Amino acid sequence: ASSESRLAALEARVTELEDLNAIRRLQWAYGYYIDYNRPEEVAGLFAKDGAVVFLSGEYVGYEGVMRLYGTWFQNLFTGGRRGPVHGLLLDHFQLQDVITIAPDGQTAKGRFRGILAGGWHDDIVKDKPEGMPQQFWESGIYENDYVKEDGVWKIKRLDYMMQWQADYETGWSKTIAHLQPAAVCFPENPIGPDRLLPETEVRQTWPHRAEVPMSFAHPVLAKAFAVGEFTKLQK
Amino acid sequence: ASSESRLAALEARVTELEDLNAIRRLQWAYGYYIDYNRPEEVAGLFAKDGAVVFLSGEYVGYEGVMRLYGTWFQNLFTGGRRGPVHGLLLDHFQLQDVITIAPDGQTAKGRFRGILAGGWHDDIVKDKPEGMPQQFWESGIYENDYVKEDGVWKIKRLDYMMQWQADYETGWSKTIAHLQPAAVCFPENPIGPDRLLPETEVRQTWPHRAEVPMSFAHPVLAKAFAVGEFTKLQK
Amino acid sequence: ASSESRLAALEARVTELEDLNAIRRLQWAYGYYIDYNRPEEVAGLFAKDGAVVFLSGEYVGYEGVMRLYGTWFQNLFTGGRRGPVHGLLLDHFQLQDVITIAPDGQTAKGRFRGILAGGWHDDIVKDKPEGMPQQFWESGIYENDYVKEDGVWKIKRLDYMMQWQADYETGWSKTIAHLQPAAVCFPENPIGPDRLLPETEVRQTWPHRAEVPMSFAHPVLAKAFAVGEFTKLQK
Numbered sequence: 001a002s003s004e005s006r007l008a009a010l011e012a013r014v015t016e017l018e019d020l021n022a023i024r025r026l027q028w029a030y031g032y033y034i035d036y037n038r039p040e041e042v043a044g045l046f047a048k049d050g051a052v053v054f055l056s057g058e059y060v061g062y063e064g065v066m067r068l069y070g071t072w073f074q075n076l077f078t079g080g081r082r083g084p085v086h087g088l089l090l091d092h093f094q095l096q097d098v099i100t101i102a103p104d105g106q107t108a109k110g111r112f113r114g115i116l117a118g119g120w121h122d123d124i125v126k127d128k129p130e131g132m133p134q135q136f137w138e139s140g141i142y143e144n145d146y147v148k149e150d151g152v153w154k155i156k157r158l159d160y161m162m163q164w165q166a167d168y169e170t171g172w173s174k175t176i177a178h179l180q181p182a183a184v185c186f187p188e189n190p191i192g193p194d195r196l197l198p199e200t201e202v203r204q205t206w207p208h209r210a211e212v213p214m215s216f217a218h219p220v221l222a223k224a225f226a227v228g229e230f231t232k233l234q235k
Numbered sequence: 236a237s238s239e240s241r242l243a244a245l246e247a248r249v250t251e252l253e254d255l256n257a258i259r260r261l262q263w264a265y266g267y268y269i270d271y272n273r274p275e276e277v278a279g280l281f282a283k284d285g286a287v288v289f290l291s292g293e294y295v296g297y298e299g300v301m302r303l304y305g306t307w308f309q310n311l312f313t314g315g316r317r318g319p320v321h322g323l324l325l326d327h328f329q330l331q332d333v334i335t336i337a338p339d340g341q342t343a344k345g346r347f348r349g350i351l352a353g354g355w356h357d358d359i360v361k362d363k364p365e366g367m368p369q370q371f372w373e374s375g376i377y378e379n380d381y382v383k384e385d386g387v388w389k390i391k392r393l394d395y396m397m398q399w400q401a402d403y404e405t406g407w408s409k410t411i412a413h414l415q416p417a418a419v420c421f422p423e424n425p426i427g428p429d430r431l432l433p434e435t436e437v438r439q440t441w442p443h444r445a446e447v448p449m450s451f452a453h454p455v456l457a458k459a460f461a462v463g464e465f466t467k468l469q470k
Numbered sequence: 471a472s473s474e475s476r477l478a479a480l481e482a483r484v485t486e487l488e489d490l491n492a493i494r495r496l497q498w499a500y501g502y503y504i505d506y507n508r509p510e511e512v513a514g515l516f517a518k519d520g521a522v523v524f525l526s527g528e529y530v531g532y533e534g535v536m537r538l539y540g541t542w543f544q545n546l547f548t549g550g551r552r553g554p555v556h557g558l559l560l561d562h563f564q565l566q567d568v569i570t571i572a573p574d575g576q577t578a579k580g581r582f583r584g585i586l587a588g589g590w591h592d593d594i595v596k597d598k599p600e601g602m603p604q605q606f607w608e609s610g611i612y613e614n615d616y617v618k619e620d621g622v623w624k625i626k627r628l629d630y631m632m633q634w635q636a637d638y639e640t641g642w643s644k645t646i647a648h649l650q651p652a653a654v655c656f657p658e659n660p661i662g663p664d665r666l667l668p669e670t671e672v673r674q675t676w677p678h679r680a681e682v683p684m685s686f687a688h689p690v691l692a693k694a695f696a697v698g699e700f701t702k703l704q705k
């Protein structure tokens with residue numbers, strides 16, 4: 001290839017490596033904001049026509065993102081204060097990024113997950129809502145969408161599918177999630193979604209389980225991967 | 236240097252950054268497959284002359300990988316069903332990659348680790364084998380080998396060295412691993428390895444401990460690192 | 471742009487991607503060393519005029535780093551032996567890197583965090599100091615400084631701000647940290663810091679909380695981010 005072909009090929013390859021970093025950074029930054037109950041910084045990560053999906057409900061735009069992370073999560077955990085605050089733990093450990101940039105470099109998908117250690121210390125337990133566990137673990141999978149807007153990566157769709165909860169004292173095997181897929185929309189429900197997902201995308205919560213399909217192709221076999229050939233070797 | 240020297244140097248540097256991403260992606264993808272008890276997708280990540288090492292035993296090729304992840308782990312946790320399934324948690328959180336690409340770019344090593352949250356919900360506990368903990372934590376270190384085959388990175392050797400287990404209710408300090416280094420080979424043992432490791436590589440399990448040497452050089456001092464100079468400053 | 475402008479721009483972009491990898495590798499390598507109570511390898515990661523900060527106290531140079539990781543942590547957990555050792559767990563799971571390289575490429579900052587699973591098995595509990603929990607969780611945030619010295623990235627300042635502790639049996643909501651911000655300097659205190667932080671940087675420990683400001687700019691809005699505009703949308 002010519003020097004011009006090689007320079008252009010290197011520019012495209014280096015942009016894709018930068019894109020992957022930038023998308024990972026959005027999720028890791030998102031984590032550090034939500035650990036502090038700081039919904040503004042979270043809302044700022046989104047494209048203006050973006051959305052967040054939580055318990056099979058869509059929260060649209062800056063308004064929806066502030067309703068979920070502010071009106072609901074902040075009022076629940078800190079009584080409507082930017083955190084962190086005395087005795088309140090809400091650590092959403094973020095990991096295991098598998099990001100796929102579209103061929104055109106203008107959109108992307110990414111799989112991630114979180115494990116949360118949460119709760120109210122004995123010092124502040126009188127501030128905990130009746131009905132909330134004092135201390136708990138949660139984990140869920142993210143399958144998110146991203147857009148590159150005027151050369152900046154932003155969150156287009158954050159889709160958090162909670163997978164399991166555990167009361168600290170009892171564990172996942174003895175815990176039922178009280179949170180269930182959304183049934184009531186905003187404004188009837190002041191902390192509810194703009195719209196429910198379609199029935200085919202509605203997920204029941206722990207201990208109910210459903211696959212979250214991979215946004216990534218099989219990294220070795222791509223579309224050549226077929227389950228059945230391998231299954232023949234199992235007993 | 237000439238434009239040709241600079242282009243070739245940039246091509247090699249950008250390939251090495253892509254190689255590191257690709258190798259990390261194999262381990263993160265491996266994780267998301269094993270969380271769903273999907274052994275086929277796991278087997279597909281391996282070179283055909285690859286192997287997996289588990290409890291000081293080698294399982295060779297697609298056949299061995301399907302025996303460990305299918306005949307053993309899938310039959311144990313889901314009764315031989317592709318997951319996920321109701322009430323069954325098997326989340327192997329993957330992290331802390333330190334990858335070393337060979338100078339020739341055709342092989343690699345990588346250190347990783349996993350922490351597992353596992354168990355049977357009360358809803359399905361009657362499906363749990365007698366003798367298994369209802370709910371547990373495990374963690375282990377991976378020191379893996381990779382090959383670049385026809386321009387695609389694949390797993391050559393996955394070596395998972397379990398380090399500790401904890402019953403959920405009691406913790407690591409009160410838990411003994413029932414799993415011990417392999418003693419019986421397939422086919423006598425229908426879920427056993429093709430071959431045992433050599434005695435010098437056999438690891439006893441928690442609370443027994445043994446170092447897993449680092450596949451990476453000291454990242455600041457490389458071969459110039461010597462323990463004793465520093466030890467002089469400790470009291 | 472000319473071929474020369476494009477080559478130089480690509481060299482700078484590829485160096486920045488390599489820099490980010492190298493800085494992440496320091497923290498991940500640091501983790502694997504401290505899990506083995508190997509302070510020498512930790513000390514080797516530091517610039518000679520580097521420091522480590524722990525409980526609002528600065529430990530300067532190789533001498534200080536060996537005092538904290540050797541004289542204190544190694545003597546505490548393994549009785550002054552390089553690990554790992556029978557029945558002693560000290561796994562500092564490292565994750566969630568957000569690294570910012572200075573424009574000149576000669577320094578960097580990075581946010582990270584750790585979650586620790588620690589303790590003495592029943593087999594060795596008679597070796598545990600009176601007053602230590604047999605088994606516990608801890609987590610903290612790192613905001614670190616790095617220098618590129620003769621083309622090698624090194625730790626200039628490791629600042630570990632412990633955020634929460636939990637006795638295994640009781641959880642974070644029922645645990646008070648016994649560790650408090652440093653009050654006594656070395657040499658009066660044989661395991662104490664060279665210097666205390668200034669009062670304005672002193673942190674009280676769990677369940678006391680204080681923000682650890684982000685070393686990174688808002689990744690979408692940068693300095694254009696303002697909290698108040700968004701807060702208007704919350705109820």
Ligand SMILES: Oc1ccc(/C=C/c2cc(O)cc(O)c2)cc1
Nearest residue numbers: 076133136137165166167175178
């Ligand atoms: O073990 C557990 C049992 C119940 C729960 C409830 C969680 C919860 C979390 C939210 O963010 C909002 C909310 O309204 C409820 C969590 C853990």
Ligand SMILES: Oc1ccc(/C=C/c2cc(O)cc(O)c2)cc1
Nearest residue numbers: 311368371372400401402410413
């Ligand atoms: O706390 C614990 C006590 C015992 C165990 C046993 C684990 C185990 C895990 C496997 O994948 C297969 C198996 O046959 C056994 C796990 C946790």
Ligand SMILES: Oc1ccc(/C=C/c2cc(O)cc(O)c2)cc1
Nearest residue numbers: 546603606607635636637645648
């Ligand atoms: O639940 C917990 C209660 C107390 C502690 C104390 C921790 C500790 C950790 C160190 O590295 C050194 C030390 O002198 C003390 C930890 C956990």
